[PDB]
Enzyme design. Structure first.
Site, PDB file in Angstrom:
ATOM      1  N   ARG A  29     132.556  47.847  16.176  1.00 55.32           N
ATOM      2  CA  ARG A  29     131.190  48.358  15.929  1.00 55.32           C
ATOM      3  C   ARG A  29     131.091  48.553  14.568  1.00 55.32           C
ATOM      4  O   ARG A  29     131.768  49.141  13.639  1.00 55.32           O
ATOM      5  CB  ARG A  29     131.550  49.685  16.637  1.00 55.32           C
ATOM      6  N   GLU A  37     119.341  48.371  20.577  1.00 53.62           N
ATOM      7  CA  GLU A  37     120.520  47.887  21.529  1.00 53.62           C
ATOM      8  C   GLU A  37     119.585  47.100  22.822  1.00 53.62           C
ATOM      9  O   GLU A  37     118.605  47.259  22.959  1.00 53.62           O
ATOM     10  CB  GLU A  37     121.046  49.071  22.252  1.00 53.62           C
ATOM     11  N   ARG A  81     136.978  50.636  20.220  1.00 54.47           N
ATOM     12  CA  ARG A  81     136.210  49.752  18.930  1.00 54.47           C
ATOM     13  C   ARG A  81     136.736  50.043  17.638  1.00 54.47           C
ATOM     14  O   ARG A  81     136.650  51.183  17.297  1.00 54.47           O
ATOM     15  CB  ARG A  81     134.748  49.595  19.291  1.00 54.47           C
TER      16      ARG A  81
END
Length: 135
Positions: A29, A37, A81
């Site tokens: 990330r 997004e 992440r």
């Protein structure tokens, strides 16, 4: 902060990239950026999301050298992440996205703020140029 080598496996979105880091595959990330997004529970592919995803993709796909830089706070989010700054041939992907008006600077997460001012600087300039999201 230290840069570490990584190898591109796959770009996933404007803000997420899969890398081979220290022998194993890992999802990253990008720290301190918030994107329009493309991956959303139920939308229609957010305005500038496709452009942000293409921008990140081209930057990492075209690079000869990818490096990862963890910050001094928490290094993974609740989805596993890695939270990091990513460099493509010495250039920070996080900063390029903001500078290009393809992302905003997010809130600081858990002590990870080393490049915050640098990114806020970049965001001011993009707003001043009325770039993309700021158009």
């Amino acid at each position: 902060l230290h840069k570490e080598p990584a190898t591109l496996i796959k770009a996933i979105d404007g803000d997420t990239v899969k890398l081979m880091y220290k022998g194993q595959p890992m999802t990253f990330r990008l720290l301190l950026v918030d994107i329009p997004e493309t991956k959303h529970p139920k939308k229609g592919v957010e305005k500038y999301g496709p452009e942000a995803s293409a921008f990140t993709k081209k930057m990492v796909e075209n690079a000869k050298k990818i490096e990862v830089e963890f910050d001094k706070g928490q290094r993974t989010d609740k989805y596993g992440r890695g939270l990091a700054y990513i460099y493509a041939d010495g250039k920070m992907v996080n900063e390029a996205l903001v500078r290009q008006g393809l992302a905003k600077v997010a809130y600081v997460y858990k002590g990870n703020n080393t490049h915050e001012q640098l990114l806020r600087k970049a965001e001011a300039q993009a707003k001043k140029e009325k770039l993309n999201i700021w158009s």
